[PDB]
Design a protein around this ligand. Structure first.
Ligand SMILES: Cc1cc2nc3c(=O)[nH]c(=O)nc-3n(C[C@H](O)[C@H](O)[C@H](O)COP(=O)(O)O)c2cc1C
Ligand SMILES: [O-][O-]
Ligand SMILES: [Mn+2]
Ligand SMILES: [Mn+2]
Ligand SMILES: [Mn+2]
Ligand SMILES: [Mn+2]
Ligand SMILES: [O-]
Lengths: 283, 129, 283
């Protein structure tokens, strides 16, 4: 049974805060002028172009899943009707993120390059594995575990590929494309915060046994996804010698994902000391 | 002393608890007043663009002349994934006032953030003498 | 299995066309200044003000249903990955429509008045019945029948309430709120066309036996929804004496809903001659 939403009676003021920020941050790939990166794009080697193409296609895969399956599967588990409305916005903006990469592809790359990059995403066992993991919980019947898998996607899985746009920006290359990605990262942060916030609200409704079972599940799912992401990172960044620094970025964001779910950071500072040039590219 | 603010998510409130320093919270509804000098710990909540970024409950607490007079420093929480907006709420409080920008941290802060704020706040209070 | 969306290879160019129109027409309730209608609102009778509130609250229920349940339930039935992205935008924009009515309510009416409108929507047997009907097919397992219920909602059920804002605008009353409704109607037209277009595409994939079964279901469902709408219209518009014209508007839109699904119009021209002042208000 449904019942028209009353935005004048909010059960959780945080729902309106996130709605105002996400809708107020509305944007489309046409807002970023990627045409100015044509010279910088041409200065990359065939291998550097191929790495960027595959990393970007991998980001599109997470965006396609989170918009088409992820955000929509959280609607029945909402605590308030406004949470449902906020979730529809996330599903839409995720589609905008996935389309932004095709706009970058259309402006910079050729048809043959795009087809090779998309065919690679179909065959890469690590990319397919991480999608099968979260998809099983999106389509499952455990609502709280679904929110943990959703938060881990927004706050951890995305950043294995978010490293490259920041790396290029640190080298004065593909600067406009990095601004496009920064608009995505700004949106992802709010999604991971909101979905993680709602996960904590559901944790307060269960018993102590369920709370401990979920903490174990989070650590198990994080490491299972991390072990798969380190293999994913090696196959891509080992040619350019960026693997060790991306792994620091991976651990750095895995701690952030844990804090979104209310848990404490796990990896120490000496394992998350990402190159400062990359962090300056973010902020 | 320590005066901090946190919303319903309490990511900043939980960091202040892990600090172990006794602190007073700016309430989500209503005004309050502080007598002793204090350091402010607030998160950022801005969007696209120094107009905003600071919580409304903090603006009311800082609009109080008696409360603003005893402000000594600001520590901002946030998230590096916000681009130039990273902890920009502390930049707004530091610029529009005479107080300095002490520290930044993300969400609940790591174990190193708690040790860094404890030692930093102790050496900053000894500087006020 | 999932597969990142490639916007450079479209199996149906209509997906990009509808996406560009829907995203290009993005708007938010804050863009329309409803505050200027406060003087006009004061010139309404106790019944005329209550009538507007009930019509708007009823529209909010249809918008809430189509955004939270309707559009999202069409994603698994999509023919192309770009159709999925368009549906996420519809699901989001539908939530924007539902919020627009709460924004209008906050500016013109009081809290006690707003609560009465929502309490009426929970108990009105006609509004609840039409919601239960579409929800039954949205949550079912018949994909083509689900698309028929969506088209009838976007192209027929909504317009029983869209009549009043156009009626006030034709009488130089509540003009700014009517501009808000025109922004909603602009979106509904594309939605009914798109969902109906996809329904026709799915019809070509089944056999003639199933095709005839769906034509029978469409006429049967239209008759069920139409008979329920006249009772809904009578209980509301009988006080202001607008019932005879709303029924003309209903048949006028029932023909639009049928034609959106590829079927021929059912009511003749002499039965859809809605008041010309109302049709001019939609311009
Ligand atoms: C709507 C919204 C906007 C935000 N904007 C920023 C920002 O501009 N810069 C930043 O560093 N963090 C930003 N954040 C992150 C919060 O500042 C961060 O989660 C903080 O720890 C929240 O504190 P609290 O949970 O104690 O209330 C934003 C969060 C939200 C929900
Ligand atoms: O607009 O959908
Ligand atoms: Mn995204
Ligand atoms: Mn997201
Ligand atoms: Mn609508
Ligand atoms: Mn619609
Ligand atoms: O992304």
């Amino acid at each position: 049974r449904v019942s028209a939403i009353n935005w004048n009676r909010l059960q959780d003021e945080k729902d309106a805060e996130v709605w105002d920020r996400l809708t107020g941050n509305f944007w489309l790939p046409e807002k970023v002028p990627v045409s100015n990166d044509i010279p910088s794009w041409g200065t990359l080697t065939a291998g550097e172009k191929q790495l960027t193409m595959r990393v970007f296609t991998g980001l599109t895969m997470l965006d396609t899943i989170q918009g088409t399956v992820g955000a929509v599967s959280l609607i029945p588990d909402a605590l308030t009707p406004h949470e449902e409305a906020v979730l529809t916005n996330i599903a839409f903006m995720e589609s905008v993120h996935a389309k932004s990469y095709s706009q970058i592809f259309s402006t910079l790359c050729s048809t043959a390059e795009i087809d090779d990059a998309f065919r690679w995403s179909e065959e890469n066992r690590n990319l397919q594995r991480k999608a099968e993991i979260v998809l099983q919980y999106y389509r499952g019947d455990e609502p709280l575990k679904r929110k943990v898998a959703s938060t881990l996607l927004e706050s951890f899985l995305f950043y294995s590929g978010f490293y490259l746009p920041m790396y290029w920006s640190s080298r004065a290359k593909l600067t406009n494309t990095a601004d496009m990605i920064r608009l995505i990262i700004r949106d992802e942060a709010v999604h991971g915060y909101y979905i993680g916030y709602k996960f904590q609200r559901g944790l307060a409704l269960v018993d102590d046994v369920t709370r401990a079972e979920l903490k174990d599940y989070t650590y198990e799912l994080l490491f299972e996804l991390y072990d798969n992401e380190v293999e994913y990172t090696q196959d891509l960044y080992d040619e350019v010698g960026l693997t060790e620094d991306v792994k620091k970025f991976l651990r750095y964001n895995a701690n952030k994902a844990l804090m979104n779910l209310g848990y404490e950071a796990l990896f120490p500072r000496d394992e998350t000391d990402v190159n400062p040039a990359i962090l300056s590219a973010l902020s | 002393s320590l005066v901090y603010f946190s919303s319903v998510s309490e990511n900043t409130h939980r960091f202040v608890q892990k600090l172990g320093i006794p602190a007073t919270r700016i309430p989500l509804h209503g005004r309050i007043e502080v007598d002793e000098p204090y350091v402010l710990i607030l998160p950022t909540y801005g969007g696209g663009r120094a107009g905003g970024y600071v919580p409304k409950q903090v603006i009311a607490f800082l609009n109080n002349d008696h409360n603003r007079a005893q402000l000594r420093g600001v520590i901002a929480a946030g998230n590096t994934n916000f681009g130039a907006e990273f902890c920009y709420a502390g930049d707004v409080v530091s610029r529009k006032c005479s107080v300095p920008y002490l520290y930044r941290f993300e969400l609940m802060g790591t174990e190193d953030d708690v040790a860094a704020v404890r030692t930093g706040l102790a050496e900053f209070w000894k500087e006020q003498t």
